[PDB]
Amino acid sequence: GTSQLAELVDAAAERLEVADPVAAFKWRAQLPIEDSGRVEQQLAKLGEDARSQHIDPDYVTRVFDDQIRATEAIEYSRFSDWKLNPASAPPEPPDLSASRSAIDSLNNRMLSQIWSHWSLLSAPSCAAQLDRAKRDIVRSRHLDSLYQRALTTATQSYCQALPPA
Amino acid sequence: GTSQLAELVDAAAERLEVADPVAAFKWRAQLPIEDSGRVEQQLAKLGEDARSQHIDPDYVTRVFDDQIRATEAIEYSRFSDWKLNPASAPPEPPDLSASRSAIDSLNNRMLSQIWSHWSLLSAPSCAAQLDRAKRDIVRSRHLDSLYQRALTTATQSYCQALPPA
Numbered sequence: 001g002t003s004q005l006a007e008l009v010d011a012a013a014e015r016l017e018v019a020d021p022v023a024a025f026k027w028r029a030q031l032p033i034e035d036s037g038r039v040e041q042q043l044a045k046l047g048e049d050a051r052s053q054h055i056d057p058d059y060v061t062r063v064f065d066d067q068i069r070a071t072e073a074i075e076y077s078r079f080s081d082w083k084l085n086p087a088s089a090p091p092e093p094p095d096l097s098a099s100r101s102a103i104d105s106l107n108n109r110m111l112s113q114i115w116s117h118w119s120l121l122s123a124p125s126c127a128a129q130l131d132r133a134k135r136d137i138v139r140s141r142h143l144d145s146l147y148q149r150a151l152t153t154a155t156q157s158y159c160q161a162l163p164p165a
Numbered sequence: 166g167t168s169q170l171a172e173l174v175d176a177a178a179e180r181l182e183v184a185d186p187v188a189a190f191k192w193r194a195q196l197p198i199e200d201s202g203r204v205e206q207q208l209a210k211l212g213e214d215a216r217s218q219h220i221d222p223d224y225v226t227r228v229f230d231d232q233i234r235a236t237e238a239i240e241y242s243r244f245s246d247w248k249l250n251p252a253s254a255p256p257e258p259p260d261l262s263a264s265r266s267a268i269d270s271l272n273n274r275m276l277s278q279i280w281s282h283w284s285l286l287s288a289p290s291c292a293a294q295l296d297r298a299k300r301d302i303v304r305s306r307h308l309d310s311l312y313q314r315a316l317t318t319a320t321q322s323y324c325q326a327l328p329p330a
């Protein structure tokens with residue numbers, strides 16, 4: 001009763017959820033949500049990680065850009081909420097450096113699954129296995145409407161993996 | 166069948182709605198939503214306008230800060246939406262300079278009503294007359310859930326006007 005893509009999508013969902021403590025920290029520290037210099041660095045490092053792990057870097061780049069976009073979308077929604085209702089901004093978020101550490105371990109989890117399941121990601125049955133995984137994770141993580149939209153954005157390029165050679 | 170605060174709240178609502186073309190323009194031009202230097206200038210000019218029009222500048226400052234916060238909240242929500250779904254970002258928004266001109270005429274409308282209705286704003290019956298106005302405007306302008314929350318934020322300090330002297 002389980003999708004081969006469950007572990008990948010669970011990681012990706014877990015990494016989206018880090019958006020909440022990140023947004024809370026940045027609100028309190030007056031940091032921007034999007035720093036395009038930083039994102040560029042993050043993607044370039046992921047590309048390098050992909051090559052060293054024998055994964056198509058162009059795939060990783062696109063996929064992680066979807067994931068980062070999704071993450072920003074959540075952060076923006078939180079900022080909207082806290083502008084309307086500043087008393088609801090969490091007053092003691094976890095350290096940004098702890099959130100980044102969580103992110104970096106999740107990046108690795110996702111890369112390791114992308115490599116392992118490359119035949120699935122690149123096969124015609126991917127779209128179905130991904131829908132199944134998404135539904136399962138939305139339920140297991142109790143993802144609300146916002147996180148649901150985000151998870152769809154973050155996974156929208158998964159099934160465009162191409163077979164090698 | 167009409168609140169004395171209807172004209173003020175209608176102006177304020179109209180000015181919130183300018184958030185949409187502003188957010189669409191800034192998305193396309195890669196401009197930030199919040200520039201705190203700019204906001205500070207905007208508030209300082211409003212304070213000066215208030216003095217010249219014999220309105221309590223401290224009131225105007227707080228009220229317009231609520232209105233600007235509300236406006237940002239809408240812009241942030243749009244940015245969240247367009248991160249998830251970039252195809253829905255309006256591709257040909259009106260000129261930012263036209264939006265600013267609309268804003269400046271609405272500022273004046275709001276200031277003129279604040280002066281005219283100062284006895285009401287500062288009286289115990291304000292809270293009731295404001296609730297009535299809000300409900301009427303939400304209906305007449307067909308304001309959705311987001312704009313409803315925003316209009317509440319933008320008007321939250323209206324009834325704290327104090328009688329002179």
Ligand SMILES: N[C@@H](Cc1c[nH]c2ccccc12)C(=O)O
Binds near residue numbers: 031032033035197198
């Ligand atoms: N779009 C801006 C929004 C923002 C959030 N926090 C900020 C702090 C400073 C300047 C801008 C911001 C950004 O991504 O940065």
Ligand SMILES: N[C@@H](Cc1c[nH]c2ccccc12)C(=O)O
Binds near residue numbers: 032033200
């Ligand atoms: N919080 C940021 C968000 C933002 C929107 N557009 C931007 C463009 C550049 C930098 C930041 C932004 C701000 O208010 O600016």
